[PDB]
Amino acid sequence: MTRRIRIGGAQMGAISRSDSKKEIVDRLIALLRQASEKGCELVVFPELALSTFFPRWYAERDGMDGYFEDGMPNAATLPLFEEARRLGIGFSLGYAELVQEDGRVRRFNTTVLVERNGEIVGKYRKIHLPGHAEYEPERSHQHLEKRYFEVGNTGFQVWDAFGGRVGMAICNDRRWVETYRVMGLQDVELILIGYNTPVADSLSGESETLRMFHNHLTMQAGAYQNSTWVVGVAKAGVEDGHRLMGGSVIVAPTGEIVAQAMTEGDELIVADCDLDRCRYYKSHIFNFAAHRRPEFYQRITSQTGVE
Amino acid sequence: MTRRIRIGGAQMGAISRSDSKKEIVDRLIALLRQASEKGCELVVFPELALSTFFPRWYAERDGMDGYFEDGMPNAATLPLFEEARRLGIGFSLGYAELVQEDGRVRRFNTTVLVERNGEIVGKYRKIHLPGHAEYEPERSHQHLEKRYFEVGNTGFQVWDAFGGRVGMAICNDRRWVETYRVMGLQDVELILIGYNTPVADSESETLRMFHNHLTMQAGAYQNSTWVVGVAKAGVEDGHRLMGGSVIVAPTGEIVAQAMTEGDELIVADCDLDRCRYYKSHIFNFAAHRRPEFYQRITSQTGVE
């Protein structure tokens, strides 16, 4: 009613190894233009939206830079930035970052937040790297994220953007309660999360709704228990025989699902999100300064395992 | 490897201010005997199960001492402990504690965990006190837990009991993720939570019951632990308390749920070995957690 922001969830379909980068960016622009027609001011793109989920393939730690981005933006992604700035829409884009810092070449799983005027707001780099680093034949599919990426060095940052507080997370960050709480302690009002969740081939029946239950459970709870909007945008479909989980959702500060995807391809979900709905819980039920006792939370920052 | 425990959720009905403490203990023993006939080895009682939910009423900070317990157990609660030991059943009981620690009187919202042999294994005191400390006429009803209780000094402890790792929380502790994680970082396998949640805010019944289960299903799943939520429901002197007592599996699934707002016992077989399955399957805390980015959780209390 008051501080309303119309957010579009630009869920992506399966990206194959045979798909060129221009075909990928054009699919991003097509979802951006639909959000502009429906009056969206911010569309959220999935994790690694500029290439297929290459951590499923095995190669040398340097021989996967073809899927990385030379710059942000570069020659291939500039048409997307020009369309967003021209239509007056900001966006969060997930991609594999290739940067030159301290002489050496570094690689991160990165999402960038762009404002409606085309100016880059912030940049979050993935913290929780899932999977493994070496080849493991014991799995039906590989997940070599720890081999192709480094641990991010940005932290869970929260910026002043889109008339409020906007934070970003990447994929399996949404399963850890520390992801929401760290940004929740920065008075966050909108958490943008793109994810690529692998899923078994013949997953169906009760086991399918269980992983979708766990997918929404972590985001609905992270939204309510921190009184913030959560937007989870997926890249779904079957990528070269590997199925990716869909179910893109926009979650309210009450943990309620206000918009959910119905397909596993290129789909755009959109909901009118009132940022002022975050304030009620922050002043009563979840008043951090009045209820939290950090002297009993020391295990969360001291140890890594259980002991 | 054979660590299976049958847990009984002994949801209590309303307790009035005019109810005697003997009437309350007899209702506890009645629920305790229902669990024995159902083969339960552990029953969970609600928060403050030995009196009405008095934080709703306004009085002096010394006034509510009539509902507190001088000892645990005392002469009024000893019949409950003797029946639990006679039946060979452990239990977790919530009560208002009056201890005296060093020349001064201290007041805590407390739950005590007892083993099947009658031996007390531990004691948790409430950490997250909700509500306010002064009378606020803007509200429909008062919730003066900050006025009558102090922040506990035990912390989220996890004990070796009932063949596994058992922890305890109290009421709105289940709303905070730190409650589950601190015990989760102690390899917890069973969290016992008694609670007293009013139906009205300051209603949204369906949304409040939604938040009641969402916080416990997420804490159970994101820590791969069993979570037992037992309520004291019913209309207490015109004030309605939410029911919905529930037993959650390490998957966040509800395996038992209360259907009434009165005295009701829900029972489910809980295999503590299920926790090791999901703790090993890519919920490994020692593998993925990066504590160098979580410093805000312990550095500050509110928003900066």
Within an 8 Å CB–CB cutoff, is residue B297 touching chain A? yes
Q: 3-class DSSP state for residue A44?
A: strand
The residue to which tokens 């007892």 are assigned: B114
Nearest Cα neighbor of B288 from A59, A62, A145 is A145
Q: Chain A: give the shortest CA distance to residue B285, in Å.
A: 5
Is the Cβ pair A301, B304 closer than 8 Å? no
Q: Which residues are CB-contacts of B233 (< 8 A; sequence separation ≥ 6)?
A: B11, B12, B13, B14, B241, B242, B243, B244, B245, B258, B260, B261, B262
Asked if the peptide bond before residue B250 counts as cis, ω within 30 degrees of 0, the response is no
- Contact status, residue A90 vs residue A116, Cβ threshold 8 Å: yes
Is the Cβ pair A213, B151 closer than 8 Å? no
Q: Compute the distance between CA of residue B60 and CA of residue A141 in angstroms, rounded to an integer.
A: 65
Q: 3-class DSSP state for residue B117?
A: coil
Structural domains of chain A, with CATH: 4-302 (3.60.110.10)
Nearest Cα neighbor of A243 from A218, A222, A264 is A264
Q: How many CB atoms lie within 10 A of CB B291?
A: 17
A231-253 CB burial, b ≥16 within 10 A, e <16: bbbbbbbebeebbbbbbbbbbbb
Q: Annotated catalytic, B47? A: yes
Q: Which residues are CB-contacts of A296 (< 8 A; sequence separation ≥ 6)?
A: B127, B155, B156, B178, B182
In chain B, which residues have their Cβ closer than 8 Å to the Cβ of A151? Answer: 290
DSSP string of B40-57?
-SEEEPPTTTTS--GGGS
Q: Which two tokens stand for residue B300?
A: 């500050």
The burial class, CB within 10 Å (0-12 / 13-18 / 19+), for B200 is middle
Side-by-side strand order, sheet with B190-195: B158-161, B164-170, B190-195, B226-231, B246-248, B254-257
The resolution of the experimental structure, rounded to one decimal in Å, is 2.8
The residue to which tokens 């991003």 are assigned: A28
Chain B, window 150-189: residues with a beta carbon less than 8 angstroms from a chain A beta carbon = 151, 155-156, 175-178, 180-182, 184-187
Method of determination used here: X-ray
Q: Compute the distance between CA of residue A136 and CA of residue A144 in angstroms, rounded to an integer.
A: 9
Residue in B130, B182, B282 nearest the CB of A291: B130
Q: Which two tokens stand for residue B215?
A: 């916080």
Q: 3-class DSSP state for residue A31?
A: helix
Q: Compute the distance between CA of residue A93 and CA of residue A233 in angstroms, rounded to an integer.
A: 10
Residue in A256, A300, A307 nearest the CB of B298: A300
- Contact status, residue A186 vs residue A228, Cβ threshold 8 Å: no
Q: Which long-range contacts (CB under 8 A, 24 or more apart) does B59-67 make?
A: B61/B147, B61/B148, B64/B96, B64/B148, B65/B98, B65/B107, B67/B96
N- to C-terminal Cα separation, chain B: 47
Q: Are strands A229-234 and A198-199 parallel, antiparallel or unpaired?
A: unpaired
H-helix segments, B157-301: 177-184, 205-221, 273-280, 285-288, 296-299
Q: Compute the distance between CA of residue B44 and CA of residue B193 in angstroms, rounded to an integer.
A: 8
Nearest Cα neighbor of B8 from B256, B274, B189 is B256
Nearest Cα neighbor of B208 from A289, A190, A224, A276 is A224
The residue to which tokens 């008075």 are assigned: A187
